[PDB]
Design an enzyme around this catalytic site. Structure first.
Site, PDB file in Angstrom:
ATOM      1  N   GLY A   1     -20.183 114.100 -14.498  1.00  0.00           N
ATOM      2  CA  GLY A   1     -21.071 113.348 -15.384  1.00  0.00           C
ATOM      3  C   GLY A   1     -20.871 111.851 -15.264  1.00  0.00           C
ATOM      4  O   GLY A   1     -21.768 111.137 -14.806  1.00  0.00           O
ATOM      5  N   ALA A   2     -19.697 111.374 -15.689  1.00  0.00           N
ATOM      6  CA  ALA A   2     -19.329 109.959 -15.564  1.00  0.00           C
ATOM      7  C   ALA A   2     -17.821 109.781 -15.704  1.00  0.00           C
ATOM      8  O   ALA A   2     -17.145 110.606 -16.336  1.00  0.00           O
ATOM      9  CB  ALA A   2     -20.072 109.101 -16.596  1.00  0.00           C
ATOM     10  N   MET A   3     -17.294 108.712 -15.112  1.00  0.00           N
ATOM     11  CA  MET A   3     -15.860 108.447 -15.177  1.00  0.00           C
ATOM     12  C   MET A   3     -15.586 106.948 -15.256  1.00  0.00           C
ATOM     13  O   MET A   3     -15.993 106.189 -14.380  1.00  0.00           O
ATOM     14  CB  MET A   3     -15.124 109.070 -13.980  1.00  0.00           C
ATOM     15  CG  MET A   3     -13.621 108.800 -13.992  1.00  0.00           C
ATOM     16  SD  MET A   3     -12.830 109.382 -15.513  1.00  0.00           S
ATOM     17  CE  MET A   3     -11.452 108.243 -15.559  1.00  0.00           C
ATOM     18  N   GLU A   4     -14.856 106.552 -16.297  1.00  0.00           N
ATOM     19  CA  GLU A   4     -14.625 105.143 -16.645  1.00  0.00           C
ATOM     20  C   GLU A   4     -13.633 104.352 -15.761  1.00  0.00           C
ATOM     21  O   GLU A   4     -12.932 103.464 -16.267  1.00  0.00           O
ATOM     22  CB  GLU A   4     -14.173 105.076 -18.117  1.00  0.00           C
ATOM     23  CG  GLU A   4     -12.738 105.576 -18.360  1.00  0.00           C
ATOM     24  CD  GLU A   4     -12.632 107.048 -18.728  1.00  0.00           C
ATOM     25  OE1 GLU A   4     -13.600 107.824 -18.536  1.00  0.00           O
ATOM     26  OE2 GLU A   4     -11.543 107.441 -19.210  1.00  0.00           O
TER      27      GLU A   4
ATOM     28  N   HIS B   1     -20.889 104.092 -23.422  1.00  0.00           N
ATOM     29  CA  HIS B   1     -19.698 104.927 -23.532  1.00  0.00           C
ATOM     30  C   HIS B   1     -18.617 104.536 -22.523  1.00  0.00           C
ATOM     31  O   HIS B   1     -17.463 104.271 -22.886  1.00  0.00           O
ATOM     32  CB  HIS B   1     -20.054 106.398 -23.347  1.00  0.00           C
ATOM     33  CG  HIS B   1     -18.862 107.299 -23.401  1.00  0.00           C
ATOM     34  ND1 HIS B   1     -18.639 108.170 -24.441  1.00  0.00           N
ATOM     35  CD2 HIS B   1     -17.807 107.436 -22.559  1.00  0.00           C
ATOM     36  CE1 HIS B   1     -17.508 108.823 -24.232  1.00  0.00           C
ATOM     37  NE2 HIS B   1     -16.983 108.396 -23.097  1.00  0.00           N
ATOM     38  N   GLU B   2     -18.986 104.519 -21.245  1.00  0.00           N
ATOM     39  CA  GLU B   2     -18.019 104.218 -20.202  1.00  0.00           C
ATOM     40  C   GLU B   2     -17.536 102.765 -20.262  1.00  0.00           C
ATOM     41  O   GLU B   2     -16.363 102.487 -20.020  1.00  0.00           O
ATOM     42  CB  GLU B   2     -18.590 104.549 -18.817  1.00  0.00           C
ATOM     43  CG  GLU B   2     -19.140 105.970 -18.679  1.00  0.00           C
ATOM     44  CD  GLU B   2     -18.165 107.057 -19.126  1.00  0.00           C
ATOM     45  OE1 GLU B   2     -18.635 108.154 -19.468  1.00  0.00           O
ATOM     46  OE2 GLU B   2     -16.939 106.826 -19.148  1.00  0.00           O
TER      47      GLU B   2
ATOM     48  N   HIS C   1     -14.665 102.026 -22.680  1.00  0.00           N
ATOM     49  CA  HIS C   1     -13.323 102.321 -22.190  1.00  0.00           C
ATOM     50  C   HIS C   1     -12.682 101.144 -21.458  1.00  0.00           C
ATOM     51  O   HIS C   1     -11.462 101.093 -21.354  1.00  0.00           O
ATOM     52  CB  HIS C   1     -13.336 103.517 -21.237  1.00  0.00           C
ATOM     53  CG  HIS C   1     -13.480 104.849 -21.904  1.00  0.00           C
ATOM     54  ND1 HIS C   1     -12.588 105.318 -22.847  1.00  0.00           N
ATOM     55  CD2 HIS C   1     -14.373 105.846 -21.701  1.00  0.00           C
ATOM     56  CE1 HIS C   1     -12.938 106.540 -23.211  1.00  0.00           C
ATOM     57  NE2 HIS C   1     -14.018 106.886 -22.530  1.00  0.00           N
TER      58      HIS C   1
ATOM     59  N   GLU D   1     -11.396 109.439 -26.042  1.00  0.00           N
ATOM     60  CA  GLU D   1     -12.759 109.940 -25.873  1.00  0.00           C
ATOM     61  C   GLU D   1     -13.549 109.931 -27.177  1.00  0.00           C
ATOM     62  O   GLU D   1     -14.746 109.655 -27.179  1.00  0.00           O
ATOM     63  CB  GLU D   1     -12.764 111.330 -25.221  1.00  0.00           C
ATOM     64  CG  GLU D   1     -12.271 111.312 -23.778  1.00  0.00           C
ATOM     65  CD  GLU D   1     -13.129 110.456 -22.850  1.00  0.00           C
ATOM     66  OE1 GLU D   1     -12.699 110.215 -21.703  1.00  0.00           O
ATOM     67  OE2 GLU D   1     -14.231 110.010 -23.254  1.00  0.00           O
TER      68      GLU D   1
HETATM   69 ZN    ZN Z   1     -15.116 108.655 -22.248  1.00  0.00          ZN
END
Ligand code: ZN
Ligand SMILES: *[C@@H]1O[C@H](CO)[C@@H](O[C@@H]2O[C@H](CO)[C@@H](O[C@@H]3O[C@H](CO)[C@@H](O)[C@H](O)[C@H]3NC(C)=O)[C@H](O)[C@H]2NC(C)=O)[C@H](O)[C@H]1NC(C)=O
Ligand SMILES: *[C@@H]1O[C@H](CO)[C@@H](O[C@@H]2O[C@H](CO)[C@@H](O[C@@H]3O[C@H](CO)[C@@H](O)[C@H](O)[C@H]3NC(C)=O)[C@H](O)[C@H]2NC(C)=O)[C@H](O)[C@H]1NC(C)=O
Ligand SMILES: *[C@@H]1O[C@H](CO)[C@@H](O[C@@H]2O[C@H](CO)[C@@H](O[C@@H]3O[C@H](CO)[C@@H](O)[C@H](O)[C@H]3NC(C)=O)[C@H](O)[C@H]2NC(C)=O)[C@H](O)[C@H]1NC(C)=O
Ligand SMILES: *[C@@H]1O[C@H](CO)[C@@H](O[C@@H]2O[C@H](CO)[C@@H](O)[C@H](O)[C@H]2NC(C)=O)[C@H](O)[C@H]1NC(C)=O
Ligand SMILES: *[C@@H]1O[C@H](CO)[C@@H](O[C@@H]2O[C@H](CO)[C@@H](O)[C@H](O)[C@H]2NC(C)=O)[C@H](O)[C@H]1NC(C)=O
Ligand SMILES: *[C@@H]1O[C@H](CO)[C@@H](O[C@@H]2O[C@H](CO)[C@@H](O)[C@H](O)[C@H]2NC(C)=O)[C@H](O)[C@H]1NC(C)=O
Ligand SMILES: *[C@@H]1O[C@H](CO)[C@@H](O[C@@H]2O[C@H](CO)[C@@H](O)[C@H](O)[C@H]2NC(C)=O)[C@H](O)[C@H]1NC(C)=O
Ligand SMILES: *[C@@H]1O[C@H](CO)[C@@H](O[C@@H]2O[C@H](CO)[C@@H](O)[C@H](O)[C@H]2NC(C)=O)[C@H](O)[C@H]1NC(C)=O
Ligand SMILES: *[C@@H]1O[C@H](CO)[C@@H](O[C@@H]2O[C@H](CO)[C@@H](O)[C@H](O)[C@H]2NC(C)=O)[C@H](O)[C@H]1NC(C)=O
Ligand code: NAG
Ligand code: NAG
Length: 902
Positions: A285-288, A321-322, A325, A344
């Site tokens: 999905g996504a990664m910060e 969201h990302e 972080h 999270e």
């Molecule tokens: Zn997150």
């Protein structure tokens, strides 16, 4: 005594200072079809306590180092012990360096290694991703360290608290671009050994965690912006995606989001640049990753031509969201995975705040209520839930760490943090937050560190007063699972709390240190006017005149559902609320108009109110124009449709919904000027989407007419789709339902030529809306053809057909008959039998259907159920629950719908 290399947690004897890492992906397979990467690394670490062993993480790496698997040197004039042997311990994922003497406290050492691994298509560590550009299959190299896979790319002390600086170098084909956390140091230089390759060195990272590292080698291009402070912002994507302008929305919102957060956190963005990259089929999905955030394409890219408004909402919230972080999580990092919920959960809350800044007319902050609060309450109202907190000593293995990433951690985490910010007030919360970030920048924390800084802010002022310490209050919400239902008797003003469970028969076996009592912040509105705030203390029962009403008055608790709880009232107060909603709904905040519906249906499930009371709470909807209260009803009634859409109850139900939605449909007909121009803001566009969906799916002639007219218009001019992306799913579906093979074959052709995944998804789904058995069966016949339906879309398509009342038996027969396909799709494509089984058996609510499912299970003789093993057990137990529910509710519900369907 156990050997330290057999323990899952690293020793504390050695701490890393800095690493040099050089990685070289080989994007051309070795003729056997194996893709590899090579690497070289040097880690400099300090000895804290004398030790004769070096234990470092290593996963799926072969060492080619000269001599032992490592070379060990002293820094400066430090002497180093001789290596005895190096070994790999696979279970605990360690490289173990046994020494002939002890390292000395205060001394620094450098350990060098050369290694190689598979550049697998496994989305783990340094990995490959394959995609198509025209006729050419492209391959890129990218990373996903998240949690415990940095060690899969190079040997490292792979725990989040063991931070260090990293000097990354990538060796890559000279015509590809190399990206990492930091900017490149300068232009790439030719690799001397083979000038077809180039060498790109990156600036030293700040002190940081291994799980946040990233490096990417690809043909990607970017759109760019330089912020006023000089920070370079880039959105990266496939050359064709960039050319089409699909990266523009992301670029648009990023600057404002970063600005919002720098101010919100009272802390400057800690990096020289921001890269965000859209990867095709990034399943995570996504990664910060710090400075280089990865996203799946459909999460970052946006096409104004075909994408709905909900797509825009997804993009801005995922980015917010990302980027959240980049401070909370990356600059200050939770010391261990047991506290993942704080990281999270925090980001899952503030994503709405960041997104709201970018789109201030959208009222995005409201969406946390349906999106996270009520979402997670569904699973947190079960005996099988778990507390946000987990003891650190219980989270050791990579599997246990992965278990931290669930609905509770993200959505309940977000809900409790939002509640905390609300009862402290945002200004006070932000003060404590800033203090926390400043104190722990480039270091690690536990959730107790945040509570302490929030407490410092509380103690530094006199306005906000709490019934206990921040820690004591939050302990009730983090150390025990679940949440209370707050019940109010407005005759006396008595107020009570009890652990809320959807199943009134369920036995809770998980013990709570607090006997499932909470300390609850309770806002209230009486006759549309805000009352003084109230705290329910750790007691089962209390009384206050705030909750005592007259015969002509009403009270309503938990304004905007800021508190993580649900509310029940005496029937008289319910009736008064209903009266208010019937006469002038504007007096009750829109979120609470939804709450009344969400809560009452849950209360009915738990047998705390009659199901008729919940249904009575939908009566005002004929006058409701806003999104959320309608959404609350649709979400709560989806199960009713699922249970009753093949029964005598369905007629009156549809008739009731037609009656309720017709005025809203008519409203938008006028507002949109004969459906030519969408409503302005996000919420109203959402309300229109739901209104049209509800109208058409319940057989409103005016909607059916609209859908037929539009689809006919499209069929007469295929190149010019006249249907706005917002309404496509409904218009496509309803039109295919009304038509025959002409509409179906047209849509099938459109699907087969579709360029964009989201448009293809809408077509696949709408094709399942045909009311012709033969078309649905022919469609089922396509689902297992890779040339016609992508493997990854197969079970989704079958489930869509199953969702069709007519397609239900067809899909169920298809799954049963073709179940002998497990030995074809499990080792070569997961397929996910669990999702297929759940979707096809979703409707089952009779003893007869239970018998059929039990009969299907009787193929237990080998073949198993694969990844859907015992997911069939869930279907068996769900059916039993449905049978019981239908029996209990059928008569009451039928009569209610007949009574109110006019
Ligand atoms: Zn997150
Ligand atoms: C981690 O990587 C760093 C970047 O490569 C290393 O630092 C660099 O070391 C190089 C030599 O190993 C220096 O380049 C030049 O080397 C020649 C050798 O023949 C010397 O004469 C030159 O003096 C030297 N150049 C200059 C301008 O001094 C780099 O200068 C130097 N880069 C820096 C300091 O940023 C680290 O050594 C390496 N770490 C470890 C532990 O090996
Ligand atoms: C890390 O080292 C591993 C062990 O040396 C390598 O895994 C081994 O690869 C070998 C060669 O590919 C396999 O042996 C056989 O090799 C011949 C000739 O290449 C093939 O005809 C055979 O098919 C092959 N055997 C099989 C059963 O396929 C080993 O089987 C295999 N060992 C394993 C998997 O435990 C890794 O390739 C190496 N990885 C990297 C990235 O360098
Ligand atoms: C990223 O930000 C850009 C700047 O805010 C946006 O650019 C805007 O795009 C709008 C839609 O294309 C334009 O609005 C109208 O477009 C129609 C059709 O092209 C024209 O007839 C109108 O003249 C035009 N103006 C109106 C209605 O006032 C905006 O002109 C344009 N704004 C600017 C400053 O260039 C991008 O849309 C945005 N990208 C995404 C994907 O949201
Ligand atoms: C990564 O690169 C940085 C930047 O060049 C290195 O930092 C230098 O380290 C040396 C020796 O420790 C010091 O003398 C310099 O003062 C440092 N420079 C800066 C700007 O901090 C770092 O050592 C490198 N990492 C490794 C493992 O070699
Ligand atoms: C970078 O160079 C490689 C190697 O020349 C290119 O890859 C080739 O692309 C063509 C398409 O024009 C294919 O027909 C070949 O099969 C590819 N060869 C190999 C060995 O992969 C690549 O197109 C170049 N990319 C860019 C962005 O310039
Ligand atoms: C972080 O917040 C502080 C406190 O609000 C900011 O400092 C204030 O800035 C205003 C703006 O003119 C001044 O009026 C105050 O006198 C300042 N207060 C103090 C105590 O210095 C600061 O600018 C913010 N810093 C960042 C990086 O966001
Ligand atoms: C994990 O974080 C703690 C802080 O929460 C770090 O401990 C601090 O280290 C700095 C720098 O040496 C000192 O100035 C502080 O006095 C320390 N604070 C303490 C002990 O409360 C700790 O170093 C971090 N762990 C690792 C492995 O880096
Ligand atoms: C509201 O709470 C009060 C007390 O907190 C309840 O009144 C008590 O009822 C018990 C019944 O056994 C009596 O023994 C006490 O003398 C009563 N206390 C008083 C009048 O102060 C009352 O029943 C509750 N009302 C509800 C739940 O509607
Ligand atoms: C409950 O939520 C609503 C929004 O759903 C809040 O109303 C917003 O309040 C802010 C600040 O006063 C305004 O900038 C917005 O324009 C309002 N939006 C709308 C749509 O009315 C309301 O303040 C919240 N109530 C409480 C008690 O917190
Ligand atoms: C819960 O415990 C009761 C006895 O208190 C028992 O009758 C019942 O079978 C148990 N389980 C469920 C799911 O109700
Ligand atoms: C309905 O309530 C709203 C909200 O206070 C108020 O502004 C409006 O005047 C009321 N309208 C009528 C017709 O009572």
């Amino acid at each position: 005594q156990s050997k330290p290399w057999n323990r899952y947690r690293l020793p504390t004897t050695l701490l890393p200072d800095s690493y040099n890492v050089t990685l070289r992906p080989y994007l051309t397979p070795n003729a056997d079809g194996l893709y590899i990467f090579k690497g070289k690394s040097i880690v400099r670490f300090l000895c804290q306590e004398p030790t004769d062993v070096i234990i470092i993480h290593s996963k799926k790496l072969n060492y080619t180092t000269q001599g032992h698997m490592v070379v060990l040197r002293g820094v400066g004039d430090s002497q180093v012990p001789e290596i005895d042997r190096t070994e790999l311990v696979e279970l605990t994922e360690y490289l173990v360096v046994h020494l002939k003497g002890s390292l000395q406290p205060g001394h620094m050492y450098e350990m060098e290694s050369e290694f190689q691994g598979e550049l697998a298509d496994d989305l783990a560590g340094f990995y490959r991703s394959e995609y198509m550009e025209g006729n050419v299959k492209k391959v890129l190299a990218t990373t996903q360290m998240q949690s415990t896979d940095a060690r899969k790319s190079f040997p490292c002390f792979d725990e989040p608290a063991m931070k260090a600086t990293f000097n990354i170098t990538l060796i890559h084909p000279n015509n590809l671009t190399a990206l990492s956390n930091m900017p490149p140091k300068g232009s790439s230089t030719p690799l001397a050994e083979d000038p077809n390759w180039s060498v790109t060195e990156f600036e030293t990272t700040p002190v940081m965690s291994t799980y946040l590292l990233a490096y990417i080698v690809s043909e990607f291009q970017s759109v760019n912006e330089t912020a006023q402070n000089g920070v370079l912002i880039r959105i990266w994507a496939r050359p064709n995606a960039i050319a089409e302008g699909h990266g523009m929305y992301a670029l648009n919102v990023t600057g404002p989001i970063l600005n919002f957060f720098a101010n919100h956190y009272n802390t400057s963005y800690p990096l020289p640049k921001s890269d965000q990259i859209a990867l095709p089929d990034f399943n995570a999905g996504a990664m910060e990753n710090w400075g280089l955030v990865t996203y799946r394409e459909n999460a970052l890219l946006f096409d104004p031509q075909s994408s709905s408004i909900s797509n825009k909402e997804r993009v801005v919230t995922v980015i917010a969201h990302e980027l959240a972080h980049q401070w909370f999580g990356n600059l200050v990092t939770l010391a261990w995975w047991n506290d993942l919920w704080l990281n999270e959960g925090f980001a899952s809350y503030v994503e709405y705040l960041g997104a709201d800044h970018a789109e201030p007319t959208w009222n995005l902050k409201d969406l946390i209520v349906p999106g996270d609060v009520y979402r997670v309450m569904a699973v947190d109202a079960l005996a099988s839930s778990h507390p946000l907190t987990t003891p650190a000593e219980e989270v050791n293995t990579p599997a246990q760490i992965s278990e931290m990433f669930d609905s509770i951690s993200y959505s309940k985490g977000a809900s409790v943090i939002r509640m905390l910010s609300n009862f402290l007030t945002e200004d006070l919360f932000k003060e404590g937050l800033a203090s926390y970030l400043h104190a722990f920048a480039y270091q690690n924390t536990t959730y107790l560190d945040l509570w302490e800084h929030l407490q410092k802010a509380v103690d530094a002022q006199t306005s906000i007063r709490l019934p206990d310490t921040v820690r004591a209050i939050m302990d009730r919400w983090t150390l025990q699972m679940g949440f209370p239902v707050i019940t109010v008797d407005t005759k006396t003003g008595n107020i009570s709390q009890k652990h809320f469970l959807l199943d009134s028969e369920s036995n809770v076996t998980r013990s709570s240190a607090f006997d499932y009592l909470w300390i609850v912040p309770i806002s209230s509105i009486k006759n549309g006017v805000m009352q003084d705030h109230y705290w329910l203390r750790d007691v089962s029962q209390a009384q206050n005149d705030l909750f005592k009403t007259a015969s002509d008055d009403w009270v309503l608790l938990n304004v905007n559902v800021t508190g993580y709880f649900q509310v029940n009232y005496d029937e008289d107060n319910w009736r008064m609320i209903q009266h208010q909603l019937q006469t002038n709904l504007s007096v009750i905040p829109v979120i609470n108009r939804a709450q009344v519906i969400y809560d009452s249906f849950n209360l009915a499930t738990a047998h705390m109110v009659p199901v008729t009371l919940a249904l009575d709470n939908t009566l005002f909807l004929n006058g409701e124009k806003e999104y959320m209260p309608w959404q609350a009803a649709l979400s709560s009634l989806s199960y009713f449709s699922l249970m009753f859409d093949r029964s005598e109850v369905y007629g009156p139900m549809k008739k009731y919904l037609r009656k309720q939605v017709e005025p809203l449909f008519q409203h938008f007909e006028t507002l949109t000027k004969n459906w030519t121009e969408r409503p302005e803001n996000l919420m109203d566009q959402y309300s229109e989407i739901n209104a049209i969906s509800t109208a058409c799916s319940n057989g409103l002639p005016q909607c059916e007419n609209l859908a037929k007219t539009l689809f006919d218009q499209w069929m007469s001019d295929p190149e010019n789709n006249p249907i706005h992306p917002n309404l496509r799913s409904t218009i496509y579906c309803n039109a295919i339902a009304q038509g025959g093979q002409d509409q179906w074959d047209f849509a099938w052709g459109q699907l087969q030529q579709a360029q964009l995944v989201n448009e293809a998804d809408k077509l696949r789904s709408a094709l399942a809306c045909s009311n012709e058995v033969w078309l649905l069966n022919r469609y089922l016949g396509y689902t297992l053809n890779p040339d016609l339906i992508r493997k990854q879309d197969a079970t989704s398509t079958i489930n869509s057909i199953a969702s069709n009342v007519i397609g239900q038996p067809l899909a169920w027969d298809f799954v049963q008959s073709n179940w002998k396909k497990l030995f074809q799709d499990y080792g070569g494509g997961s397929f996910s039998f669990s999702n297929l089984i759940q979707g096809v058996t979703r409707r089952f609510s009779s003893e007869f259907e239970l018998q059929q499912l039990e009969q299907f299970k009787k193929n237990n003789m080998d073949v198993g159920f694969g990844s859907g093993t015992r997911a069939l057990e869930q279907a068996l137990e769900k059916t039993k629950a449905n049978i019981k529910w239908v029996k209990e509710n059928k008569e009451v519900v039928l009569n209610w719908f007949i009574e109110h369907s006019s």
